[PDB]
Design a protein around this nucleic acid. Structure first.
Ligand SMILES: [Mg+2]
Ligand SMILES: [Mg+2]
Ligand SMILES: [Mg+2]
Ligand SMILES: [Mg+2]
Ligand SMILES: [Mg+2]
Ligand SMILES: [Mg+2]
Lengths: 97, 47, 110, 105, 250
RNA sequence: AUUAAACCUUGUACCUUUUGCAUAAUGAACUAACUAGAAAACUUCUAACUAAAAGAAUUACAGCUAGAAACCCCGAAACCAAAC
């Protein structure tokens, strides 16, 4: 194989930037705040998987439910095919029955 | 162009051996090299 | 113009006359002329503990750590706490001053 | 590997046992870090074992040079001029003590 | 005038309350001005570092969402027609130029879509983690109890110098009862300083305490934390979401 | 092994595969990069609280909650729709 003939540039991480310093604050907003807000409400992400977890087939179906009607034609077609592939895998294949 | 700094580092030492061994430098007295105090070494010689 | 006082050392050596200081401090705090069995007297009263421990810290220069504050149930516990010395010398400092044999040499890079 | 490697005959340095036995190990140098988990085991070695070892072998000059470091390294110098370096990264005091005694012998 | 604080709630008879040295940030030499009594079941619980590990990992994972994605062999452009006949050419059999065995093909088992790592520990477990973290700081002399956060001047330099004088760690976490009432002088100083991070009482978390060497707690915040956490034990199981009206819950 | 590179002694390529055998039969000129095990019903292990556990709907004659722990790749002849 081949390896670099020079050392790559040093990578410097500032561990006291604002994002890292205050990471985690308000994770106990509920228990310490009279349960006004559940901590799951603080997650920033796709609408269909805020405060939710599942396997890919479940993830595929959940993406369709929330934004199935606002998706592009090609993206929706690929999602439908992705669901049908996963369905036959998880429900008809695998070592265990 | 792979990730990481370590693979380059191990190779940089491989380059070190290639250059030094192919073209060795002239010998230098042990005094010039690190970890030398004259008095302590003299004591050990007698002991 | 708040000027930071010079940093204090975090090493404490028990004074020989520590007993005289402690007995005098107890007398001053409560004014009972050191009733017999003074050590057994408890520090349950919040005001009593604060006056005693704080006064000793000002004079001696060492104060009970918050972690060890609760275990100072009685004067005897307070007396024992001050008696034990506190050293700021690192374990390396002992090696440097240990007078190691000549064949052993140590150099500090930090 | 026998055909793939060099070989020699049994030998000594200067007829070590004919006259007076002279210790072959000449110098040991150990570099350590004040604040590093990997060198923690070696820091214990310097606290206790190094002093005993120095007196036991008075013909081995010992250099300890604590520095900001990632891997503690021991360099052994013999009288014939041969050098040997062994990595001590994250080794306990028991391992170092046994390892150093092999170098002296 | 010794500032004396005692537990408002009832301590178990067998347990003895822990104590702390109340301090004031107003003066450089105002190290000790009062004495406090901290509830044992909050500041003296048994030392268990697995719960700190459990909560610390939780404060890492549930938020996590990963956006790494790789196309599969069907989503890759092209690869519809069969490249060549099975036999007669002396080459292996392939049904699409876009397969996992082909340069430019689709990944075999790669990251798919956005993934979520969301899970919540039980309510008592995460509350217990806060109690454990509180004791660890107290015993290791990293927790300082203060009456109020008032400072003589807004200059950041004063706050940094004071920490060294009092032997506090480089990174200090400051907790106040409520965000709205916090003094303006502290606000200016802490904002300019990276290591000194100021949070409100409700935003206390295990991860923040682990990252920050020392922790400064105001007296009202200690009472606030003491009630919240000690409510978690001696409580029923929720008939409802707690936010809904309850007979004896704020 | 050897004083000595070769002479002297010992030794039926590899993988897959056939029965657990090959002197078979498949596959490989060589180099670099790429190229195939994925899910938590039941079980085990680890903790929180405990006739109760769970941050609403769930389960319970010691349970309940949370964590960790699992099930691949390439390849037809074809079939249907719509263009050309
Ligand atoms: Mg296609
Ligand atoms: Mg076709
Ligand atoms: Mg095909
Ligand atoms: Mg691609
Ligand atoms: Mg071939
Ligand atoms: Mg197939």
């Amino acid at each position: 194989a081949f390896v670099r003939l020079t050392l790559p540039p040093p990578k410097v991480v500032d561990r006291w930037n604002e994002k890292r310093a205050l990471f985690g604050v308000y994770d106990n907003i509920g228990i310490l705040g009279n349960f006004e807000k559940h901590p799951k409400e603080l997650i920033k992400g796709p609408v269909w998987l805020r405060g939710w977890r599942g396997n890919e087939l479940q993830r595929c179906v959940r993406k369709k439910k929330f934004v199935g009607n606002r998706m592009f034609i090609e993206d929706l077609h690929n999602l439908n095919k992705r669901i049908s592939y996963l369905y036959k895998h998880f429900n008809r294949h695998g070592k265990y029955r | 162009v792979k990730k990481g700094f370590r693979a380059a580092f191990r190779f940089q030492k491989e380059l070190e051996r290639w250059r030094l061994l192919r073209c060795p430098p002239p010998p230098v007295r042990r005094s010039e090299k690190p970890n030398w105090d004259y008095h302590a070494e003299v004591q050990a010689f007698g002991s | 113009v708040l000027v930071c006082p010079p940093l204090r050392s975090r090493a404490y050596t028990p004074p020989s006359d520590l007993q005289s200081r402690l007995e005098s401090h107890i007398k001053e705090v409560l004014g009972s002329s050191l009733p017999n069995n003074w050590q057994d007297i408890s520090l349950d009263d919040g005001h009593m503990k604060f006056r005693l421990l704080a006064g000793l810290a000002d004079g001696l220069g060492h104060a009970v750590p918050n972690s060890r504050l609760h275990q100072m149930c009685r004067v005897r516990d307070v007396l024992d706490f001050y008696n034990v010395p506190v050293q700021d010398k690192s374990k390396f400092d002992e090696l440097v001053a240990s007078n190691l044999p000549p064949n052993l040499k140590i150099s500090w890079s930090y | 590997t026998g055909r793939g490697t060099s070989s020699r005959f049994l030998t000594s340095v200067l007829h070590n046992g004919l006259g007076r036995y002279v210790q072959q190990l000449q110098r040991l140098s150990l570099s350590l870090s004040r604040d590093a988990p990997s060198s923690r085991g070696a820091r214990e070695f310097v606290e206790r074992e190094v002093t005993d070892f120095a007196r036991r072998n008075p013909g081995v000059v010992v250099y300890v040079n604590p520095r900001p470091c990632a891997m503690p390294r021991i360099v052994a110098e013999y009288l014939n001029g041969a050098v040997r370096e062994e990595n001590v990264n994250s080794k306990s005091v028991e391992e170092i003590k046994s390892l150093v005694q092999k170098l002296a012998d | 005038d010794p500032v004396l604080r005692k537990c408002e709630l009832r301590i178990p008879v067998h347990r003895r309350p822990v104590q702390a040295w109340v301090e004031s940030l107003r003066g450089f030499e105002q190290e000790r001005i009062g004495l406090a009594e901290l509830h044992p079941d909050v500041f003296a619980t048994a030392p268990r570092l697995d719960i700190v590990h459990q909560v610390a990992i939780w404060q890492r994972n549930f938020r996590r969402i990963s956006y790494a994605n790789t196309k599969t062999r069907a989503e890759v452009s092209g690869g519809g027609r069969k490249p060549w006949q099975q036999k007669g050419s002396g080459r292996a059999r392939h049904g699409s130029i876009r397969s996992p065995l082909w340069r430019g093909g689709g990944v075999a088992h790669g990251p798919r879509g956005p993934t979520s790592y969301y899970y919540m520990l039980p309510m008592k477990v995460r509350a217990l983690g806060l109690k454990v973290a509180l004791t660890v700081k107290l015993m290791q002399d990293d927790l300082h109890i203060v009456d109020s956060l008032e400072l003589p001047t807004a200059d950041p330099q004063y706050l940094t110098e004071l920490a060294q004088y009092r032997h506090w760690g480089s990174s200090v976490l400051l907790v106040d009862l409520t965000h709205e009432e916090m003094p303006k002088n502290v606000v200016a100083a802490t904002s300019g300083l990276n290591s000194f991070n100021l949070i409100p009482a409700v935003g206390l978390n295990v991860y923040s305490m682990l990252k920050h060497q020392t922790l400064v707690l105001t007296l009202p915040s200690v009472a606030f934390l003491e009630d919240k956490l000690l409510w978690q034990d001696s409580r029923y199981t929720p008939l409802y979401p707690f936010r809904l009206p309850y007979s004896d819950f704020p």
